Design a protein around this ligand. Structure first.
Ligand SMILES: O=c1ccn([C@@H]2O[C@H](COP(=O)(O)OP(=O)(O)O[C@H]3O[C@H](CO)[C@@H](O)[C@H](O)[C@H]3O)[C@@H](O)[C@H]2O)c(=O)[nH]1
Ligand SMILES: O=c1ccn([C@@H]2O[C@H](COP(=O)(O)OP(=O)(O)O[C@H]3O[C@H](CO)[C@@H](O)[C@H](O)[C@H]3O)[C@@H](O)[C@H]2O)c(=O)[nH]1
Ligand SMILES: [Cl-]
Ligand SMILES: [Mn+2]
Ligand SMILES: [Mn+2]
Lengths: 256, 256
């Protein structure tokens, strides 16, 4: 509990909003775990200070700096910057186990039971469901694993240009091994899927614990009417939760 | 082997073409198992005779007939006709274990190793990957299970208007139980996914054992140029395999 953390990532100010909403949603649902966020120097000082309030720990990662372990890998594969920054989540050995969550996720219920899971546990990716979606995963910080991941990144890159490809390649037994490493889809519910299989969403969507705003269009790319408490024209329910947290908890926090 | 079967289903002539191509693809890849097809009286006599050549067993199911076990359920839920017909796959107790395959699937490699699997084994559905896709599944014929499925169909119907919803509801432990009941996605590769996650298809698509032509547009809805051996404007590779089998093996069979 005290050495377990939800870990997110923001490399800019737009995703910082996501991270702040995510962080707030975790607090709203009374996590007993630490909240940690990987940030980069490209995150402005005001977003950083807001992150320092919402999160227990704000970690600055500067892969553009030569002193960074991932930097050499970035020079080789400069398109892999976000991924390489994300991989620093494994560097957080002050924690024994973390749930990584993308900054464009949103928690709708307490998900501390994720810490029962082992590395690497993740929900299936829609589209290619023998890959896990790397938007939400349970992992164990380890310099060793970090180094191994960096090594694979350097050598092979990523089959999809992002962390997801690399993580699937590295944690490649996921599809065929240990059903407990399949997180229920409701722990990483693709916002695309809330219309991609409408009947299944109708059937099981009320059980959503985490919504993952895949895009294209992120929640902060919408216009939200604070009077009608709804985004302006998907079924907006989740966007509206995001915006309510953003409006209620995050914006007042930033107003300095 | 002798009492195991691939089982498909056709309720009309268009899907009969699918079934004939599927059946042919299974023979082309040298299955040691029986090939069985559920047909309805709505399947014309010429398609039926072709099916009798390709398949070891052609089973006629007429849920419109009062004598059919499913008929009462059809009267109650008449939109569930295709599903109710499909469920008769469980009535095929002359087989100890079957792989049900939709008539719009296509086999690209021998998949007899599916018979190692237990009921209910199926690949994840893209879109909502905690549901299995009912296009391809390993099951054990049983009047008992058939009756139980019919009972659930009668009582609850299907959350998606088709067999998939009902099968997921009935075989509801799939998502959380026994990784061996997750068939690799390559045993039921959604044709939608061959562009939905292009990088993953690029990475793993060459391993495709079964392509499942989800639609909208079925392989027989395309125009195929027999000179260029390609469908006229997806990546057409799989459509072209389908059409080559259709052109090479199925059409000459029907020319009576
Ligand atoms: O400019 C950026 C881009 C990404 N991120 C971080 O990296 C995560 C992933 O990027 P995101 O924009 O959320 O990507 P998605 O729209 O969720 O989709 C990508 O990321 C998913 C999970 O990481 C994969 O399933 C997809 O295939 C891939 O396209 C974000 O949530 C952030 O935490 C940033 O901080 N800044
Ligand atoms: O008029 C019909 C319709 C269906 N079938 C049979 O039933 C199967 C399922 O129908 P199909 O047209 O292939 O549906 P799909 O395009 O594959 O999609 C449906 O069926 C899938 C698996 O059964 C589910 O994953 C989807 O959610 C559902 O929309 C077919 O392959 C045939 O075997 C017929 O014989 N005649
Ligand atoms: Cl298991
Ligand atoms: Mn994301
Ligand atoms: Mn189908």
């Amino acid at each position: 509990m005290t050495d377990q953390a939800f870990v997110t990532l923001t490399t800019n100010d737009a995703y910082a909003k996501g991270a702040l909403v995510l962080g707030s949603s975790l607090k709203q649902h009374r996590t007993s775990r630490r909240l940690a966020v990987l940030t980069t120097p490209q995150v402005s000082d005001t977003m950083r200070k807001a992150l320092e309030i919402v999160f227990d720990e704000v970690i600055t990662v500067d892969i553009l700096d030569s002193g960074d372990s991932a930097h050499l890998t970035l020079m080789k594969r400069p398109e892999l910057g976000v991924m390489l920054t994300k991989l620093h989540c494994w560097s957080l050995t002050q924690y024994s186990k973390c749930v990584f969550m993308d900054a464009d996720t949103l928690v709708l219920a307490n998900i501390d039971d994720l810490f029962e899971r082992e590395e690497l546990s993740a929900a299936p990716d829609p589209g290619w469901p023998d890959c896990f979606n790397s938007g939400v995963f349970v992992y164990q910080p380890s310099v060793e694993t970090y180094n191994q991941l960096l090594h694979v990144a350097s050598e092979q890159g990523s089959f999809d240009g992002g962390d997801q490809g690399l993580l699937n390649t590295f944690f490649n037994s996921w599809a065929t091994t240990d059903i407990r490493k399949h997180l229920p889809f409701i722990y990483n519910l693709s916002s695309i899927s809330i219309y991609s299989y409408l009947p299944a969403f109708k059937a099981f969507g009320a059980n959503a614990k985490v919504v993952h705003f895949l895009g294209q269009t992120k929640p902060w790319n919408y216009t939200y009417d604070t009077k009608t408490k709804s985004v302006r024209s998907t079924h907006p329910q989740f966007l509206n939760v995001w915006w309510d947290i953003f409006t209620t908890s995050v914006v007042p926090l930033l107003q300095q």
